[PDB]
């Protein structure tokens, strides 16, 4: 193991982290670690454990207080770092977190882009992750983001491909699977919530919140309309419906009276998920705890505010001394926001820049991580100037394309039709006239043959006879036409690839990730496990 270490030291020392300037290794003192008043507290973790999850939902239910779910494991890096942080930091406060936020609800530590990115980027495993996690944190609830089909990737998968990694994650030490769809479509996510529910954890039934419900000017995502996705997800028996606001666009009125409106129509407990890029975020969380919100979404205030969650803090002193309080140690959380300061000094070469309230989000409707990398995509194909005008196409090509709800990986869709529609300098009047001629990109081309699922209201017509020239367009669940995976054959194969005999959880990986699984496991052959290593160690060695 030693010859490992030593190759991949000298190869970081020599020809640099690949992706980043290259810097010398200045120098860093040793993260402060927390000093924490401990207190004994029954958790969630402890209540879903002993009685299930209704006792949880119960619970929550009993709840006057409004629970927090950090989100600093997460989607705080994902927002803010690139989801570059790495297991090596997580650990070192790991336990703080566990011991002195015994109040938090769970813990959002899996899924979205941590699954992908710690394989390509990081080269170490996310089922690794998850079980040193696990094994650190043993009294919280961890949560994941399950994107409904498509799980932790970007494409539809077969329905047994999804029950079995919804087993094994649920078996690994995931609690809370927050399953929402890109496009707000049920049937992706019934048998995802039916899975959840059949492997014993809390299945998060999501709406992904677009538009705005107090603009009479677009009437499509109406307070009606969330009334009747937020029935129908009753009626799955998911245990939690959650509120997912992507690009931060829910305003603190539009928060109060939508949070309301659900509450009348559901008796399911309500989380909110919102992002403090519009710097509302703070006041539009204040304004569901005034509309009897349950669970919200928070982070530490070192990786807080802009594309990221608002911070826990603030969230605490903004409701302290209000009809209802947070439920947090608030000493215990500065104290680990001092550390996460201490760690975040780590990752600059991955930060994003100079951030500021943003409120043109309102407009152009774009989720900070489509955000940051749309830009990146924009400066790798020399586009980087005119970004303002990729914000107005990205708008124009969201509301041609029917006003489609915006998140990964629908958002991706809309930003590959505006980079690709300013890449060759046309308008959607030229789409109309020429767009039988022109190549479309593929995400765009699969979204409109129904691979993504059905958008409200259906498609374009025309233009979606534009965008497939000849191909065929399926109107139904794209898992049904899914090509056949046999778990023993796979296992076989994975065998025969990567030389040993893999546990459930790499098959269930090289089945999402073909590639992405096989680069990381041929990196670990030549460098091992470099997840040991210190973060500026592990960038510049
Ligand atoms: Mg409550
Ligand atoms: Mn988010």
């Avoid at 490992?4 to 200045?26: A, C, D």
């Avoid at 570059?84 to 790991?94: E, H, S, T, Y």
């Avoid at 911070?311 to 680990?336: C, D, F, T, W």
Wanted: charged share 25%; net charge negative.
């Amino acid at each position: 193991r030693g010859t490992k270490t030593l190759h991949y030291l000298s190869m970081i020392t020599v020809n640099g982290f690949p992706g980043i300037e290259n810097t010398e290794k200045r120098h860093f003192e040793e993260p402060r670690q927390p000093l924490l008043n401990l207190e004994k507290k029954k958790t969630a973790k402890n209540i879903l454990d002993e009685q299930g999850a209704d006792a949880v939902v119960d619970y929550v239910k009993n709840t006057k207080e409004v629970l927090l779910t950090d989100t600093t494991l997460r989607d705080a890096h994902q927002s803010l770092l690139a989801t570059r942080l790495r297991l090596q930091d997580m650990k070192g406060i790991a336990q703080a977190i566990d011991q002195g936020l015994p109040e938090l609800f769970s813990a959002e530590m899996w899924g979205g882009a941590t699954f992908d990115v710690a394989y390509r980027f990081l080269n170490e495993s996310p089922w690794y992750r998850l079980r040193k996690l696990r094994k650190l944190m043993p009294n919280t609830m961890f949560q994941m983001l399950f994107r409904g089909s498509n799980a932790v990737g970007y494409q539809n998968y077969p329905d047994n491909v999804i029950e079995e990694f919804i087993r094994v994650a649920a078996h690994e030490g995931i609690d809370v699977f927050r399953i929402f769809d890109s496009l707000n479509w049920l049937p992706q996510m019934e048998k995802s919530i039916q899975a959840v529910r059949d492997n014993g954890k809390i299945a998060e039934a999501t709406i992904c919140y677009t538009g705005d419900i107090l603009d009479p000017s677009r009437p499509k995502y109406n307070i009606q309309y969330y009334k009747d996705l937020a029935k129908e997800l009753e009626a799955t028996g998911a245990h939690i419906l959650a509120v997912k606001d992507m690009a931060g666009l829910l305003k603190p009125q539009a928060a109060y009276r939508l949070i309301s409106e659900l509450k009348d129509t559901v008796d399911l407990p309500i989380h909110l998920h919102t992002h403090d890029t519009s710097g509302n975020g703070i006041i539009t969380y204040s304004g569901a705890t005034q509309a009897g919100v349950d669970i919200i979404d928070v982070a530490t205030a070192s990786l807080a505010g802009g594309t990221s969650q608002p911070s826990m803090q603030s969230i605490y002193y903004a409701l302290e001394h209000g009809p209802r309080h947070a439920s947090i140690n608030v000493k215990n959380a500065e104290q680990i926001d001092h550390y996460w300061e201490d760690v975040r000094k780590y990752y600059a070469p991955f930060e994003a820049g100079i951030t500021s309230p943003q409120t043109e989000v309102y407009m152009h409707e774009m989720p900070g991580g489509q955000y940051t990398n749309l830009k990146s995509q924009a400066a790798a194909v020399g586009l980087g100037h005119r970004f303002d005008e990729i914000k107005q196409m990205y708008r124009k090509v969201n509301m041609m394309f029917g006003d489609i709800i915006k998140v990964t990986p629908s958002s991706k869709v809309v930003g590959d039709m505006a980079l690709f529609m300013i890449q060759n300098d046309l308008t959607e009047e030229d789409v109309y006239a020429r767009g039988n001629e022109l190549n479309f990109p593929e995400s765009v081309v699969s979204f409109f043959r129904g691979d993504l699922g059905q958008p409200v209201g259906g498609f374009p017509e025309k233009l979606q006879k534009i965008i497939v020239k000849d191909k065929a367009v399926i109107t139904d669940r794209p898992g049904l036409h899914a090509e056949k995976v046999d778990f023993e054959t796979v296992k076989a194969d994975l065998e025969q690839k990567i030389g040993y005999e893999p546990g459930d959880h790499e098959v269930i990986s090289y089945i999402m990730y073909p590639q992405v699984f096989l680069d990381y496991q041929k990196m670990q052959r030549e460098f091992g496990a470099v997840t040991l290593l210190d973060t500026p160690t592990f960038l510049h060695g």
